[PDB]
């Protein structure tokens, strides 16, 4: 599949991403402006908009299960529970030990039909194994879905069973940056 | 997703198609030589290679559930049961009302881990509503998966419940034609 540009109609945040038509989950990503001098930013903002039947969602930021930073999240009542994880060998991903801070942003909304997780991921483009993503280039992201609850919903490091579905999409990171990024951080669409 | 060319590692048949990594089902298509002085053939040869947990598989020849020719198949014991179907509004597809002949080819196998349906589909590129596919250009195919048995597996027109997954892939039909098509019909890889 291929990502495209879209706007969140309630927040006005502009993302790059996709909606999976099977589970009707939307994945969106937006990056701070590219730099002219120096290193690129290592953070981005993302969103997951999922029907409540979605019991947990994962994002594989290198587009594969193993050897890349994983984001996992689920609704626990009126709360989003989330973590950064890492996997080797196709087994239960465990707590990431690198430098990454996953922040739930105030736009996050949970209602009777959907959970909408809006997050900031600082340090998430470069991982402690030396890999990461090139925000000037084209790459692949992947998502993982389950309709079965995690083993302990109040624990961010809960174990859980393998996803019931997973999928991929191409993304042109060079067109995924926004001049309004800082405004998103202040809760402004611009 | 995107189709590519591949070779059946048992028969040597060359197909165009994909392997869905989630359910590990391979979908393959091959067409007769392109004509330039006549209208195109309306038939093709296809294959479904599916792990036994796949209780039914559908192929949507126009890339969508409704108003296009669908192919549905499942293993019942040591035999493949299959049908041509049609749907008008996201409900149980029923028997196609046009002229189309689905023939199981002898390369078809069923064993303990997989069922492999190799078939001939005559009258399958042009449909009795005036629609169809253009085998000289680019199009989209779709598939449907379920891991729940059909209601009555010995009946080709059995009802069943909605797929648990579905997906799409782009296919360049202009690249999917083969000089070996007639050989395939005779059971030869050529
Ligand atoms: C105990 C939990 C998990 C188990 C046992 C597990 C197991 C597996 C297995 C066996 C596969 C191969 C499937 C195939 O190709 O047929 C796979 C694929 C994959 N998994 Fe998981 N998984 C789990 C959690 C996760 C998480 C939480 C994520 C993302 C945050 C994820 C992302 C993926 C992706 C993207 C693939 C396909 C690409 C690749 O093969 O790496 N998995 N997983
Ligand atoms: C009793 C059986 C079936 C029911 C109730 C049914 C129902 C549905 C529904 C409700 C959707 C929309 C899902 C969404 O977008 O969230 C859908 C999509 C789809 N269905 Fe089915 N389905 C069934 C059988 C089949 C079969 C046999 C095929 C293929 C031979 C098929 C192919 C598709 C495809 C490819 C899509 C996605 C594209 C589209 O929206 O047209 N369906 N189906
Ligand atoms: C729970 O939250 C979800 C996600 O925010 C709500 O679905 C979203 O509802 C908005 C309506 O504010 C939809 O936005 C668009 O609104 C315009 C109105 O001009 C309309 O023209 C568009 O067709 C579209 O509806 C948005 O599409 C929709 N998103 C999804 C994924 O369904 C949902 O309504 C909330 N549920 C409750 C009970 O409040
Ligand atoms: C049950 O049916 C399945 C599906 O046809 C069989 O799996 C397939 O078996 C072939 C034969 O060994 C596999 O071989 C491949 O062979 C080529 C030819 O040299 C080789 O280059 C490839 O690297 C590969 O090893 C084929 O991959 C495999 N396909 C799938 C989807 O599993 C299975 O062997 C059958 N079981 C029995 C007991 O007959």
Contacts of A1 in chain B (CB under 8 A): 1
Q: What single-letter DSSP state applies at residue A35?
A: P
Angle formed at CA A123 by CA A121 and CA A127, multiple of 5 degrees: 115
Q: How far, in Å, CA of A114 to CA of A128, rounded?
A: 34
DSSP, collapsed to helix, strand or coil, labels residue B175 as: helix
Partners of residue A17 on adjacent β-strands = A4, A28
* Any ligand 4 atom below 6 A from CB of B109: yes
Ligand 1 pocket: which of A20, A48, A65 to mutate (most atoms within 8 A of CB): A65
Atom of ligand 1 nearest to the CA of A92: 1
* Any ligand 4 atom below 6 A from CB of B10: yes
Query: What are the residue ranges of helices labelled H in chain B?
Result: 181-185
Q: What are phi and psi of A33, to 5 degrees?
A: -55, 140
Q: How far, in Å, CA of B136 to CA of B74, rounded?
A: 30
Atom 12 in ligand 3: residue holding the nearest Cα: A10
DSSP, collapsed to helix, strand or coil, labels residue A116 as: strand
Q: Count CB neighbours of A91 within 10 A.
A: 10
Q: What are phi and psi of A19, to 5 degrees?
A: -115, 120
| Burial class of residue B88, CB neighbours in 10 A (0-12, 13-18, 19+) | exposed
**Residue B67, both tokens:** 């108003």
Atom 4 in ligand 4: residue holding the nearest Cα: B114
Q: Report the sign of the C-alpha dihedral through residues A123, A129, A135, A140, in that order.
A: negative
Question: Which residue in A167, A168, A170 has the most chain B C-beta atoms within 10 A of its own C-beta, making it the best mutation to test that interface?
Answer: A167
Atom of ligand 1 nearest to the CA of A66: 41
Q: What single-letter DSSP state applies at residue A13?
A: -
Residues with CB under 6 A from ligand 1: A 58-60, 64-66, 70, 72, 90-93, 142, 144, 160-163, 166; B 21, 24
Q: What is the strand order of the sheet A79-86 is part of?
A: A94-95, A79-86, A70-76, A56-60, A138-146, A165-172
Contact A174, A138 (CB under 8 A): yes
Residue A163's Cα: distance from chain center in Å? 16
Query: What are the residue ranges of helices labelled H in chain A?
Result: 181-185
Q: What single-letter DSSP state applies at residue A132?
A: B
Q: How far, in Å, CA of B65 to CA of B60, rounded?
A: 6
Contacts of A21 in chain B (CB under 8 A): 166
Q: Do B166 and A22 touch (CB under 8 A)?
A: yes
Q: How far, in Å, CA of B136 to CA of B35, rounded?
A: 10
Buried b (16+ CB within 10 A) or exposed e, A48-65: bbbeeebbbbbbbbbbeb
DSSP, collapsed to helix, strand or coil, labels residue B182 as: helix
| Burial class of residue B74, CB neighbours in 10 A (0-12, 13-18, 19+) | buried
Residue B9 CB partners (closer than 8 Å, separation 6+): none
Angle formed at CA B11 by CA B6 and CA B13, multiple of 5 degrees: 40
Ligand 3 pocket: which of A10, A52, A112 to mutate (most atoms within 8 A of CB): A10
Contact B104, B80 (CB under 8 A): yes
Q: How far, in Å, CA of B1 to CA of A173, rounded?
A: 19
Q: What are phi and psi of B182, to 5 degrees?
A: -65, -40
Atom of ligand 1 nearest to the CA of A143: 35
Contacts of A168 in chain B (CB under 8 A): 1
Ligand with an atom nearest the CA of residue B51: 4
What stretch of H or E contains B170?
strand B165-172
User: How many A from CA of A92 to the centre of ligand 1?
Assistant: 9
For this entry, resolution in Å reads 1.9
Partners of residue A126 on adjacent β-strands = A132
User: How many A from CA of A48 to the centre of ligand 3?
Assistant: 14
CATH for A2-190 is: 2.60.40.1210
């Amino acid at each position: 599949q291929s990502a495209s540009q879209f706007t969140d109609p309630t927040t006005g945040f502009q993302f790059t991403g996709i909606t999976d038509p099977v589970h009707d989950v939307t994945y969106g990503f937006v990056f701070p402006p590219l730099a002219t001098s120096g290193a690129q930013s290592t953070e981005f903002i993302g969103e997951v908009v999922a029907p409540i039947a979605s019991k947990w969602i994962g994002i594989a930021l290198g587009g594969a299960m193993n050897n890349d930073l994983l984001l996992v999240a689920w609704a626990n009542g009126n709360q989003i529970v989330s973590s950064t994880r890492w996997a080797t060998g196709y087994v239960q991903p465990t707590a990431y030990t690198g430098t990454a801070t996953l922040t739930t942003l105030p736009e996050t909304t949970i209602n009777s039909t959907h959970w909408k997780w809006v997050f900031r991921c600082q340090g998430c483009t470069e991982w402690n194994n030396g890999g990461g993503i090139d925000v000037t280039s084209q790459g692949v992201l992947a998502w993982a879905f389950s309709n079965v609850a995690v083993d302990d919903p109040s624990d961010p490091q809960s174990t859980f069973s393998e996803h019931t579905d997973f999928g991929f999409f191409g993304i042109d990171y060079s067109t995924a940056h926004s001049a309004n990024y800082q405004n998103y951080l202040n809760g402004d669409s611009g």
